[PDB]
Amino acid sequence: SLPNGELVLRTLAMPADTNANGDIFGGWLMSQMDIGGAIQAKEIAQGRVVTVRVDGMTFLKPVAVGDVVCCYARCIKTGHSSITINIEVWVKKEPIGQRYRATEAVFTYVAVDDAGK
Amino acid sequence: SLPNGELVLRTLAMPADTNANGDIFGGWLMSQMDIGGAIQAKEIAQGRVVTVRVDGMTFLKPVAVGDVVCCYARCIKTGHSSITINIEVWVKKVSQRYRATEAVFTYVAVDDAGKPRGLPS
Amino acid sequence: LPNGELVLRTLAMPADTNANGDIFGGWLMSQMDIGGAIQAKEIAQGRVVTVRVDGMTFLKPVAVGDVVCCYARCIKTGHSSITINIEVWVKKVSQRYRATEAVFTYVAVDDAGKPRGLPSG
Amino acid sequence: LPNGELVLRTLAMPADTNANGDIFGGWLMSQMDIGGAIQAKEIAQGRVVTVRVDGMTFLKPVAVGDVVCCYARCIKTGHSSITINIEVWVKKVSGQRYRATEAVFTYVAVDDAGKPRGLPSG
Amino acid sequence: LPNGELVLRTLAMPADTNANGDIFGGWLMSQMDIGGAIQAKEIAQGRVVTVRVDGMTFLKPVAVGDVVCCYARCIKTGHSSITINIEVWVKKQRYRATEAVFTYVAVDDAGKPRGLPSG
Amino acid sequence: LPNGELVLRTLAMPADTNANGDIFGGWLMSQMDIGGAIQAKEIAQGRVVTVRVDGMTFLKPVAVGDVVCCYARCIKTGHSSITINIEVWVKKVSSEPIGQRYRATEAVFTYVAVDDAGKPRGLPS
């Protein structure tokens, strides 16, 4: 019941976002996080942004299909161009209603205008 | 700033979901609603649920690309197997909060053979 | 037997399913919307918009690999508004049975997304 | 004029575009495969698998927002091999009619193990 | 063993299957369309458009979790029509699962035919 | 020409695009996790799981219609733990500035050979 930051994305793990095994593909997790961080940055940049680096990504617990994947983003650095955002991914519900932290990572964004600088 | 029901789904409107004018085709909207509602319905029924009825759907305001679409569901009725849930579709960043869709989705708790089952209280 | 125009003849794909094995009725409603938007665009001979969906019922489940057919009939031809009755009949690939019924409402819109009058044909 | 029976009828969504904005042209092949597979599964009175595509012609291109109608007509059958000519016609709703595709699709009826199986004449 | 240059190496995804569970052959042909259009755009040095597919053969089935390799080899040097021979080899032991002969046409920005330099 | 093994090779598609027209990051990462996962399953002869992603830098943007290539190189083997350096290069620049191949992303990925119960397992050496 207690995630840090603001919930930016809350979706359902579709079976299309899997691997050969059937598991939720981590790649795809990383895509979900890139999107959510770009969201908070776009709130911050007051516009369109562009990602340049990602540090310290950790995949804590696996994700299954049919679980709700909640993304919680919280900004970290009062940087001029280096919009740094801390992103974690929590999964819900096998006993239904089970919350656990599934990803920890530190995203670094850079605000780009119609001409990024 | 409190939504009456729970935010069950929050995604970004991607251009994959467009029409010829440029708004999001509300196929995609109804799918979002049905899934988002199914989540909380599944919270209640403690098993599989099935959409059985969808009434009074209104597309209040249009949806654009690159915007955040938020779905808020609040249950109203629990009958025999029926979980009735009122669903709202809000957009978060115009590019401002407005309700863009409202509807009443009605679900039914089922077994593996698609037939009714009681609601676990 | 089906009344109206066959607007769509499509197959139930796995990509469109849930965990159960049946098609998520997200997908069905998407199909019915496409099917309505087509006839509406014929009537308005231009762009339309889904604005209202009433009395949708998911009668019978639909499996994967079956043919999904939508049958549409206009009922009301308002000033800009086109009302269309849509039904989904499934043919069995791998027998017709109607699995869903709904009443879609579209609106004749122009190129700038604003309502417009209805032609005569 | 439209020779064959309508197996598939759908609308072109933008979800399926290329770089300029046209319909991705393998996707048509995806449709032809499904639609032909339909009449094949009709005849084989069971399941089939695609094995050959001969002489496919892209007569006229297709854009987004048009209705695509697929017509399957059988020509030849083997013990297991089903030959079907497919025509793809466009209505251009967003109502001019014209043929968009011609091809000869060949399928094979397989049993539970994946080997070909027999066909009753009727 | 495989003939030509590898334009695509993609993984068979679940969403790409048919009802039985095999890889959808629609999808295979979809991948081949791309594999051919790549080499067609490289040869033509601009836009191309698919206009014909000859002798497409599905040799062996594919399941999910295999590596799909697309091999294109140009075969005929004409004025307008660019014919490209395409094979698909699957990994998991590599084996050729598909063969076909694609025919493309060089186009301008207006989807109209255009000249070929050193076709 | 680049190092490692080509594990993934795809075309930059639309619908994976942003407002500007270049493909946004994270499809790129989807491809890197995939591309690495291939070679890891080949090497461990069984199931693996991404556990860590190190030092990712977005060097150059990628437009739509360009060829996206993954080259993976294993570097480290633990008892079960596999560290692999993954490279993403673009083969073709749209239609015309053809043959200008350039690396667009690189990172150091960490996967782990696990069983069906997701538990680590020894590595086939």
XYZ file of C-alpha atoms in Angstrom:
725
model
C 0.000 0.000 0.000
C 3.040 2.256 0.181
C 4.894 3.321 -2.992
C 7.197 6.252 -3.153
C 6.629 9.009 -5.763
C 3.568 9.424 -8.035
C 1.908 6.497 -9.892
C 2.498 7.365 -13.552
C 1.348 4.174 -15.294
C -1.030 1.396 -14.246
C -1.690 -1.293 -16.818
C -2.404 -4.955 -17.201
C 0.343 -7.401 -18.163
C -0.858 -8.717 -21.488
C 0.263 -12.117 -22.806
C 1.577 -10.284 -25.861
C 4.355 -8.699 -23.787
C 6.021 -12.037 -23.088
C 8.916 -14.214 -24.151
C 9.297 -17.757 -25.457
C 8.799 -18.990 -21.928
C 5.634 -17.032 -21.356
C 7.144 -14.716 -18.752
C 6.806 -10.959 -18.686
C 9.680 -9.735 -20.720
C 11.998 -7.462 -18.825
C 12.770 -5.478 -21.954
C 9.136 -4.520 -21.971
C 9.368 -3.547 -18.323
C 12.221 -1.267 -19.229
C 10.002 0.222 -22.013
C 7.226 0.872 -19.516
C 9.649 2.637 -17.230
C 11.169 4.733 -20.054
C 7.665 5.882 -20.932
C 6.679 6.778 -17.354
C 9.867 8.708 -16.731
C 9.434 10.539 -20.008
C 5.994 11.471 -18.664
C 7.209 13.033 -15.443
C 9.979 14.766 -17.361
C 7.502 16.119 -19.886
C 5.614 17.478 -16.876
C 8.921 19.004 -15.830
C 10.309 20.058 -19.218
C 6.891 21.544 -20.002
C 7.312 19.782 -23.347
C 8.930 17.022 -25.391
C 12.054 15.319 -23.975
C 14.892 12.947 -24.926
C 16.616 10.200 -22.850
C 20.428 9.936 -22.766
C 21.442 7.549 -19.976
C 20.089 4.960 -17.522
C 21.962 3.922 -14.369
C 21.453 1.270 -11.715
C 18.568 -0.758 -13.080
C 17.656 -3.664 -10.910
C 15.073 -6.302 -11.558
C 14.062 -7.435 -8.092
C 11.133 -9.865 -8.639
C 9.646 -11.461 -11.774
C 6.312 -10.416 -13.373
C 3.549 -12.686 -14.641
C 0.799 -12.154 -17.192
C -2.515 -10.992 -15.741
C -0.939 -8.889 -12.977
C -1.303 -5.157 -12.665
C 2.000 -3.471 -13.186
C 2.132 -0.100 -11.403
C 5.016 2.351 -12.122
C 6.063 4.850 -9.476
C 8.302 7.730 -10.543
C 9.893 10.310 -8.216
C 12.321 13.044 -9.380
C 15.787 13.167 -7.714
C 18.005 16.023 -8.960
C 17.414 19.682 -9.343
C 19.472 19.669 -12.554
C 19.227 22.242 -15.341
C 19.255 19.869 -18.313
C 19.846 16.611 -16.470
C 16.284 15.771 -15.417
C 16.953 12.777 -13.149
C 14.015 10.598 -12.206
C 13.955 7.617 -9.844
C 11.688 4.880 -11.198
C 10.387 1.739 -9.509
C 7.948 -0.937 -10.762
C 5.490 -2.606 -8.390
C 3.314 -5.497 -9.323
C -0.089 -6.340 -7.865
C -1.755 -9.730 -7.129
C -0.865 -16.511 -6.365
C -2.850 -14.575 -3.809
C -4.784 -11.650 -5.287
C -3.878 -8.258 -3.879
C -0.168 -8.918 -3.387
C 2.027 -5.928 -3.736
C 5.784 -6.308 -4.125
C 8.575 -4.159 -5.580
C 9.750 -5.615 -8.957
C 12.131 -2.954 -10.267
C 14.353 -0.259 -8.984
C 16.194 2.029 -11.487
C 17.599 5.565 -12.036
C 16.626 7.284 -15.302
C 18.283 10.347 -16.648
C 16.424 12.556 -19.094
C 17.285 15.684 -21.014
C 14.763 18.296 -22.056
C 14.676 18.989 -25.762
C 12.695 21.780 -27.309
C 11.673 21.750 -30.980
C 15.432 22.044 -31.257
C 17.015 20.260 -28.295
C 19.906 21.943 -26.508
C -8.343 16.144 -6.038
C -10.057 12.881 -5.127
C -11.564 10.607 -7.774
C -14.656 8.799 -6.364
C -13.601 5.319 -7.566
C -10.105 3.848 -7.952
C -7.689 4.623 -10.745
C -7.391 1.130 -12.219
C -5.463 1.959 -15.406
C -3.094 4.746 -16.452
C -1.509 4.719 -19.868
C -0.293 7.203 -22.492
C -2.256 7.798 -25.726
C 0.084 6.547 -28.427
C -0.333 7.310 -32.134
C -0.899 3.580 -32.731
C -4.506 4.262 -31.762
C -5.494 6.950 -34.210
C -8.047 7.676 -36.897
C -7.953 9.764 -40.012
C -8.623 13.142 -38.138
C -6.043 12.390 -35.413
C -8.059 11.535 -32.287
C -7.860 8.225 -30.554
C -10.281 5.730 -31.978
C -12.646 4.777 -29.182
C -12.443 1.142 -29.875
C -9.239 1.483 -27.934
C -11.078 3.475 -25.270
C -13.707 0.787 -24.717
C -10.979 -1.846 -24.493
C -9.178 0.232 -21.882
C -12.322 0.614 -19.914
C -13.310 -2.992 -20.079
C -9.864 -4.151 -18.916
C -9.524 -1.506 -16.200
C -12.932 -2.376 -14.828
C -12.167 -6.058 -15.065
C -9.278 -5.482 -12.715
C -11.335 -4.233 -9.786
C -14.150 -6.668 -10.678
C -11.528 -9.412 -10.387
C -10.547 -7.873 -7.054
C -14.106 -8.452 -5.887
C -15.027 -11.836 -7.447
C -11.775 -13.546 -6.326
C -11.589 -15.369 -9.698
C -12.439 -14.982 -13.371
C -15.077 -12.508 -14.370
C -16.961 -11.988 -17.625
C -18.365 -8.889 -19.238
C -22.078 -9.414 -19.707
C -23.563 -5.930 -20.099
C -22.290 -2.403 -21.031
C -24.759 0.504 -20.904
C -25.023 4.291 -21.367
C -21.623 5.000 -22.850
C -20.785 8.570 -23.706
C -17.659 9.948 -25.305
C -17.678 13.310 -23.569
C -14.437 14.832 -24.863
C -11.919 13.747 -27.569
C -8.559 12.171 -26.909
C -5.252 13.181 -28.486
C -1.869 11.516 -29.065
C 0.876 11.632 -26.431
C -1.614 12.223 -23.602
C -2.223 10.371 -20.406
C -5.466 8.392 -20.229
C -6.695 7.609 -16.738
C -9.518 5.174 -15.959
C -11.471 5.383 -12.690
C -13.861 2.616 -11.656
C -16.285 2.442 -8.677
C -18.561 -0.566 -8.117
C -22.215 0.134 -7.523
C -23.936 -3.244 -7.445
C -23.219 -6.762 -6.300
C -25.971 -9.168 -7.257
C -25.737 -12.920 -7.718
C -22.578 -12.992 -9.853
C -22.898 -9.448 -11.103
C -20.311 -6.845 -10.338
C -21.636 -3.547 -11.696
C -18.956 -0.889 -12.098
C -19.206 2.770 -13.221
C -16.182 3.755 -15.312
C -14.677 7.151 -16.137
C -12.044 8.036 -18.653
C -9.972 11.140 -17.905
C -7.092 12.649 -19.797
C -4.241 14.054 -17.740
C -2.088 16.258 -19.956
C -3.726 18.032 -22.871
C -0.318 18.229 -24.543
C -5.750 19.744 -17.578
C -8.265 17.183 -16.412
C -11.495 16.430 -18.225
C -13.800 13.424 -18.220
C -13.566 12.024 -21.752
C -15.700 8.899 -21.403
C -18.308 7.570 -18.985
C -20.016 4.174 -19.031
C -21.519 1.404 -16.899
C -19.788 -1.959 -17.254
C -21.472 -5.012 -15.797
C -19.442 -8.172 -15.132
C -20.091 -11.774 -14.046
C -17.869 -14.074 -11.962
C -17.341 -17.400 -13.822
C -15.532 -20.734 -13.624
C -13.306 -22.194 -16.366
C -16.436 -23.277 -18.257
C -17.910 -19.767 -18.583
C -20.867 -20.407 -16.259
C -21.975 -18.276 -13.237
C -20.617 -18.582 -9.722
C -21.386 -16.852 -6.434
C -19.566 -13.767 -5.236
C -17.270 -14.474 -2.316
C -18.368 -12.517 0.718
C -31.158 -14.922 -39.102
C -29.003 -11.827 -39.520
C -30.693 -8.610 -40.636
C -28.722 -5.706 -42.104
C -25.421 -5.356 -43.917
C -22.410 -7.572 -43.270
C -19.821 -4.894 -42.588
C -16.953 -7.063 -41.350
C -15.837 -10.654 -41.793
C -12.958 -11.332 -39.472
C -11.379 -14.208 -37.560
C -10.866 -14.505 -33.803
C -7.084 -14.272 -33.281
C -5.165 -15.459 -30.190
C -3.494 -12.058 -29.885
C -6.955 -10.808 -28.967
C -7.651 -13.148 -26.144
C -7.553 -13.257 -22.417
C -6.064 -16.022 -20.238
C -9.243 -18.084 -20.603
C -9.041 -18.902 -24.315
C -11.904 -16.743 -25.439
C -11.727 -13.427 -27.168
C -11.588 -10.447 -24.812
C -14.679 -8.422 -25.528
C -12.621 -5.412 -25.775
C -11.901 -6.943 -29.158
C -15.552 -7.515 -30.038
C -16.597 -4.017 -29.189
C -13.663 -2.766 -31.298
C -14.964 -4.788 -34.208
C -18.513 -3.562 -33.783
C -17.273 0.047 -33.701
C -15.336 -0.433 -36.922
C -18.361 -2.021 -38.524
C -20.600 0.832 -37.514
C -18.144 3.555 -38.547
C -18.047 2.083 -42.031
C -21.805 2.282 -42.753
C -21.934 5.652 -41.104
C -19.196 6.898 -43.399
C -21.251 5.576 -46.302
C -24.322 7.434 -45.113
C -22.478 10.673 -44.351
C -20.022 9.935 -47.218
C -17.377 11.490 -45.031
C -15.996 11.390 -41.492
C -18.029 10.142 -38.486
C -17.478 9.729 -34.782
C -18.670 7.244 -32.183
C -20.602 9.177 -29.547
C -22.863 6.769 -27.898
C -23.212 3.052 -27.314
C -26.366 1.717 -25.687
C -27.729 -1.721 -24.759
C -24.639 -3.781 -25.451
C -25.009 -7.389 -24.383
C -22.349 -10.109 -24.405
C -24.722 -13.051 -24.904
C -22.522 -15.992 -25.752
C -18.815 -16.467 -25.384
C -16.694 -16.568 -28.553
C -13.717 -18.825 -29.048
C -10.432 -18.377 -30.860
C -10.330 -19.325 -34.537
C -14.002 -18.616 -35.273
C -15.355 -16.193 -37.858
C -16.639 -12.969 -36.433
C -19.300 -11.283 -38.582
C -20.936 -7.887 -37.819
C -24.362 -7.043 -39.139
C -25.345 -3.335 -39.077
C -28.719 -1.510 -39.686
C -29.274 2.258 -39.394
C -32.312 3.190 -37.263
C -32.174 6.910 -36.758
C -30.844 9.484 -39.173
C -30.718 12.605 -37.009
C -29.375 15.928 -38.218
C -25.732 14.906 -37.904
C -26.371 11.730 -35.893
C -26.452 8.291 -37.401
C -27.801 5.522 -35.174
C -26.706 1.978 -36.068
C -27.745 -1.380 -34.642
C -24.792 -3.835 -34.626
C -24.876 -7.561 -34.019
C -22.096 -10.078 -33.961
C -22.710 -13.508 -35.378
C -20.080 -16.102 -35.190
C -19.531 -18.777 -37.766
C -17.675 -21.842 -36.546
C -14.465 -22.801 -38.262
C -12.549 -25.322 -36.177
C -22.928 -22.839 -37.141
C -23.905 -19.254 -36.587
C -24.713 -18.066 -33.118
C -25.056 -14.450 -32.038
C -22.757 -13.629 -29.179
C -23.237 -9.848 -28.834
C -25.790 -7.155 -29.630
C -25.340 -3.394 -29.330
C -26.637 -0.056 -30.489
C -24.014 2.327 -31.766
C -24.437 6.017 -32.344
C -22.200 7.995 -34.684
C -21.994 11.636 -35.682
C -21.241 13.076 -39.101
C -18.209 15.206 -38.663
C -16.130 17.291 -40.996
C -12.377 17.422 -41.522
C -11.970 19.711 -38.441
C -13.789 17.277 -36.189
C -16.978 19.366 -36.041
C -20.549 18.087 -36.715
C -22.210 18.443 -40.128
C -25.502 17.848 -41.963
C -26.598 14.612 -43.560
C -26.713 14.066 -47.377
C -29.453 12.433 -49.484
C -28.710 9.307 -51.780
C -16.111 -8.713 -61.556
C -15.614 -10.385 -58.087
C -14.893 -14.041 -58.649
C -15.022 -16.246 -55.555
C -16.691 -16.152 -52.200
C -16.086 -13.529 -49.532
C -14.076 -15.091 -46.746
C -12.727 -11.906 -45.120
C -13.951 -8.312 -44.933
C -12.200 -5.715 -42.841
C -11.301 -1.970 -42.648
C -7.722 -0.694 -43.080
C -6.582 0.829 -39.715
C -3.515 3.105 -39.333
C -2.084 0.524 -36.898
C -0.828 -1.174 -40.079
C 1.119 1.451 -41.989
C 4.561 1.817 -43.492
C 6.757 4.894 -43.582
C 4.860 7.015 -46.102
C 1.439 6.019 -44.795
C 0.314 3.100 -46.973
C -0.700 -0.343 -45.801
C 2.167 -2.677 -44.922
C 2.245 -5.154 -47.816
C 3.025 -8.374 -46.013
C -0.040 -7.781 -43.901
C -2.208 -8.306 -46.977
C -0.436 -11.626 -47.284
C -1.418 -12.200 -43.640
C -5.041 -11.584 -44.546
C -4.910 -13.703 -47.670
C -3.434 -16.467 -45.667
C -6.188 -16.288 -43.077
C -9.068 -15.916 -45.519
C -7.895 -18.687 -47.794
C -7.218 -20.843 -44.776
C -10.889 -20.358 -44.044
C -12.283 -21.959 -47.192
C -9.567 -24.573 -46.808
C -10.660 -25.491 -43.249
C -14.177 -25.563 -44.688
C -13.260 -28.160 -47.286
C -10.705 -30.205 -45.305
C -13.404 -30.544 -42.626
C -10.659 -29.902 -40.151
C -7.395 -28.056 -39.595
C -4.822 -27.049 -42.293
C -1.315 -25.513 -42.623
C -0.058 -23.118 -45.370
C 2.622 -24.517 -47.636
C 2.742 -22.518 -50.837
C 2.010 -19.085 -52.327
C 2.343 -18.801 -56.109
C 1.834 -15.883 -58.440
C 0.718 -13.135 -56.046
C 0.165 -9.806 -57.823
C -0.265 -6.375 -56.228
C -2.526 -4.708 -58.823
C -3.351 -1.506 -57.015
C -2.036 -0.200 -53.669
C -4.224 0.188 -50.563
C -4.504 3.094 -48.095
C -5.865 3.466 -44.552
C -9.621 3.703 -44.001
C -10.671 1.464 -46.894
C -12.685 -1.755 -46.724
C -10.796 -4.847 -47.818
C -12.829 -7.765 -49.119
C -11.140 -11.174 -49.635
C -12.467 -13.649 -52.103
C -11.410 -17.244 -52.034
C -12.198 -19.656 -54.859
C -10.954 -23.230 -55.000
C -9.393 -24.566 -58.196
C -7.669 -27.894 -57.547
C -7.426 -30.461 -54.738
C -4.940 -33.278 -54.005
C -5.056 -35.981 -51.361
C -4.199 -33.279 -48.830
C -3.148 -30.217 -50.980
C -5.734 -27.487 -51.470
C -5.305 -24.949 -54.236
C -7.148 -21.644 -53.857
C -7.186 -18.523 -55.958
C -7.586 -15.394 -53.911
C -8.751 -12.038 -55.128
C -8.643 -8.987 -52.950
C -11.063 -6.195 -53.753
C -11.181 -2.658 -52.275
C -14.299 -0.538 -51.730
C -12.478 2.722 -50.948
C -15.197 3.914 -48.576
C -13.495 6.769 -46.732
C -17.355 3.481 -53.094
C -15.198 2.712 -56.107
C -14.566 -1.014 -56.506
C -11.407 -2.526 -57.919
C -9.277 -5.686 -57.502
C -6.255 -5.230 -55.261
C -4.711 -8.740 -55.184
C -4.423 -12.011 -57.170
C -2.732 -15.159 -55.848
C -2.642 -18.947 -55.726
C -2.504 -20.207 -52.178
C -1.841 -23.874 -51.457
C -2.629 -25.475 -48.098
C -2.194 -28.983 -46.571
C -4.650 -30.885 -44.365
C -2.817 -32.415 -41.469
C -3.884 -34.735 -38.697
C -3.108 -34.503 -35.023
C 0.585 -35.326 -35.715
C 1.210 -32.901 -38.554
C 1.077 -35.385 -41.389
C -1.257 -35.012 -44.356
C -4.652 -36.767 -44.226
C -7.291 -38.163 -46.571
C -10.219 -36.457 -48.217
C -13.692 -37.827 -49.014
C -14.911 -36.853 -52.474
C -18.284 -35.349 -51.579
C 24.397 -23.080 -46.408
C 21.986 -20.123 -46.332
C 22.158 -18.006 -49.490
C 22.433 -14.263 -49.432
C 22.680 -11.427 -46.960
C 20.961 -11.428 -43.591
C 18.556 -8.558 -43.535
C 16.447 -9.684 -40.564
C 17.040 -11.758 -37.470
C 13.953 -11.593 -35.421
C 12.504 -13.709 -32.682
C 9.246 -15.611 -33.118
C 6.811 -13.853 -30.793
C 3.650 -15.424 -29.321
C 1.389 -12.748 -30.792
C 2.537 -13.982 -34.181
C 0.826 -17.369 -34.077
C -2.331 -18.899 -35.491
C -5.018 -20.798 -33.620
C -3.206 -24.155 -33.502
C -0.031 -22.699 -32.015
C 2.335 -22.662 -35.007
C 3.947 -19.498 -36.226
C 1.485 -17.702 -38.458
C 2.609 -17.932 -42.097
C 1.072 -14.669 -42.807
C 3.762 -13.510 -40.402
C 6.553 -15.310 -42.181
C 5.543 -13.742 -45.453
C 5.271 -10.427 -43.613
C 8.872 -10.712 -42.508
C 9.955 -11.710 -46.011
C 8.244 -8.603 -47.448
C 10.524 -6.490 -45.251
C 13.629 -8.500 -45.934
C 13.139 -7.985 -49.646
C 12.214 -4.289 -49.415
C 15.438 -3.624 -47.525
C 17.699 -4.839 -50.318
C 15.330 -3.310 -52.849
C 15.736 0.111 -51.175
C 19.512 -0.354 -50.987
C 19.751 -1.281 -54.664
C 17.266 1.378 -55.775
C 18.775 3.987 -53.433
C 15.242 5.282 -52.670
C 11.681 3.985 -52.172
C 10.453 0.665 -53.427
C 7.031 -1.043 -53.538
C 6.105 -4.728 -53.462
C 4.236 -5.796 -56.626
C 4.728 -9.567 -56.942
C 5.592 -12.776 -55.063
C 6.531 -15.882 -57.004
C 7.110 -19.452 -55.924
C 6.687 -19.014 -52.203
C 7.310 -22.214 -50.373
C 6.756 -23.169 -46.736
C 9.173 -26.033 -46.099
C 9.173 -26.536 -42.286
C 7.010 -25.159 -39.408
C 8.169 -22.716 -36.735
C 7.320 -22.531 -33.017
C 7.786 -19.603 -30.607
C 11.259 -18.857 -29.208
C 13.197 -19.551 -32.383
C 15.487 -17.230 -34.261
C 14.167 -16.257 -37.682
C 16.877 -15.311 -40.147
C 16.046 -13.617 -43.435
C 18.356 -13.906 -46.411
C 18.032 -11.830 -49.507
C 19.958 -12.331 -52.773
C 19.206 -10.223 -55.834
C 18.863 -12.307 -58.956
C 17.805 -10.208 -61.945
C 19.111 -6.803 -63.085
C 16.485 -4.992 -65.060
C 15.244 -1.502 -65.798
C 12.148 -1.410 -63.633
C 11.383 -4.682 -61.918
C 13.794 -5.721 -59.150
C 13.494 -9.469 -58.515
C 15.048 -10.683 -55.200
C 15.352 -14.317 -54.014
C 14.545 -14.788 -50.319
C 15.215 -17.608 -47.885
C 14.297 -18.042 -44.295
C 16.421 -20.134 -41.975
C 15.408 -20.935 -38.417
C 17.608 -21.625 -35.434
C 16.577 -24.279 -32.920
C 20.602 -26.605 -35.260
C 19.867 -24.181 -38.070
C 17.500 -25.263 -40.805
C 15.920 -23.656 -43.827
C 12.217 -23.333 -43.242
C 11.143 -21.097 -46.177
C 12.020 -20.050 -49.754
C 10.379 -17.504 -52.098
C 11.124 -15.115 -54.991
C 9.999 -11.497 -54.446
C 9.516 -8.885 -57.135
C 9.710 -5.133 -56.293
C 9.360 -1.826 -58.183
C 11.377 1.385 -57.519
C 9.156 4.353 -56.773
C 9.310 8.028 -56.224
C 7.652 10.005 -53.410
C 4.408 9.873 -55.388
C 4.282 6.081 -55.390
C 4.976 6.200 -59.114
C 7.707 4.192 -60.796
C 11.178 5.740 -61.054
C 14.495 4.946 -62.716
C 17.136 2.601 -61.399
C 20.773 3.602 -61.266
C 23.084 0.650 -61.873
C 20.201 -1.724 -61.165
C 32.746 -5.205 -38.511
C 31.464 -4.549 -34.971
C 32.292 -6.838 -32.096
C 30.171 -9.647 -30.662
C 27.513 -11.841 -32.271
C 24.526 -10.453 -34.141
C 21.705 -11.615 -31.934
C 18.930 -9.302 -33.192
C 18.347 -7.423 -36.427
C 15.145 -5.467 -36.991
C 13.775 -2.465 -38.879
C 12.736 0.748 -37.105
C 8.933 0.628 -37.420
C 6.168 3.227 -37.093
C 3.900 2.931 -34.046
C 7.144 2.670 -32.109
C 7.578 6.324 -32.907
C 7.212 9.577 -31.006
C 5.936 13.044 -31.981
C 9.210 14.046 -33.674
C 9.676 10.959 -35.848
C 12.663 9.187 -34.333
C 12.086 5.918 -32.498
C 11.991 6.596 -28.750
C 14.128 4.732 -26.238
C 12.823 1.590 -24.618
C 11.850 -0.223 -27.781
C 15.559 -0.039 -28.180
C 15.902 -1.538 -24.703
C 13.237 -4.184 -25.512
C 15.486 -5.229 -28.380
C 18.625 -5.213 -26.239
C 17.047 -7.438 -23.589
C 15.827 -9.740 -26.350
C 19.094 -9.801 -28.202
C 20.983 -10.606 -25.021
C 18.441 -13.197 -23.905
C 19.048 -15.156 -27.085
C 22.724 -15.653 -26.562
C 22.168 -16.338 -22.872
C 19.744 -19.177 -23.684
C 22.214 -20.542 -26.199
C 25.043 -20.474 -23.634
C 23.274 -21.617 -20.428
C 21.323 -24.222 -22.464
C 18.255 -23.253 -20.487
C 16.289 -20.475 -18.890
C 17.796 -17.128 -17.976
C 16.436 -13.909 -16.491
C 17.643 -10.310 -16.900
C 18.745 -9.197 -13.429
C 20.675 -6.025 -13.968
C 21.303 -3.395 -16.663
C 24.458 -1.376 -16.374
C 25.660 1.885 -17.887
C 23.229 2.505 -20.712
C 23.972 5.549 -22.830
C 21.883 6.945 -25.677
C 24.589 7.839 -28.109
C 22.656 8.606 -31.272
C 18.953 8.867 -32.195
C 17.316 6.397 -34.643
C 14.787 7.341 -37.260
C 11.999 5.273 -38.699
C 12.928 3.115 -41.701
C 16.419 2.373 -40.422
C 17.889 -1.061 -39.602
C 18.460 -1.713 -35.880
C 21.171 -4.303 -35.115
C 22.062 -6.040 -31.788
C 25.513 -7.483 -31.213
C 25.942 -9.311 -27.919
C 29.214 -10.353 -26.323
C 29.479 -12.462 -23.218
C 32.285 -11.281 -20.935
C 31.722 -12.870 -17.528
C 30.533 -16.192 -16.273
C 29.778 -16.641 -12.565
C 28.579 -19.928 -11.166
C 25.238 -19.101 -12.711
C 25.656 -15.334 -13.468
C 26.228 -14.123 -17.067
C 27.450 -10.582 -17.866
C 27.068 -9.535 -21.537
C 28.005 -6.306 -23.311
C 25.318 -5.403 -25.860
C 25.703 -3.070 -28.815
C 22.988 -1.434 -30.944
C 24.100 -0.168 -34.317
C 22.040 1.238 -37.167
C 22.736 -0.256 -40.600
C 20.992 2.113 -43.002
C 20.004 5.745 -42.678
C 16.454 5.850 -44.050
C 16.491 5.787 -47.855
C 19.665 7.548 -48.890
C 22.609 8.056 -46.552
C 23.007 4.352 -47.031
C 25.895 2.463 -45.473
C 26.537 4.938 -42.710
C 26.465 2.460 -39.943
C 26.680 3.809 -36.481
C 26.161 2.532 -32.966
C 23.095 4.012 -31.324
C 23.110 2.379 -27.878
C 25.331 0.246 -25.746
C 24.927 -1.251 -22.302
C 26.142 -4.031 -20.035
C 23.409 -6.532 -19.307
C 23.290 -9.123 -16.536
C 21.265 -12.350 -16.920
C 21.021 -15.443 -14.739
C 20.534 -19.161 -15.541
C 17.533 -20.247 -13.499
C 15.240 -23.227 -13.280
C 11.449 -23.477 -13.825
C 11.031 -22.471 -10.234
C 13.013 -19.343 -11.077
C 15.872 -20.457 -8.918
C 19.463 -20.080 -10.025
C 21.221 -23.129 -11.387
C 24.750 -24.116 -12.274
C 26.214 -23.078 -15.590
C 27.144 -25.615 -18.277
C 30.854 -25.051 -18.710
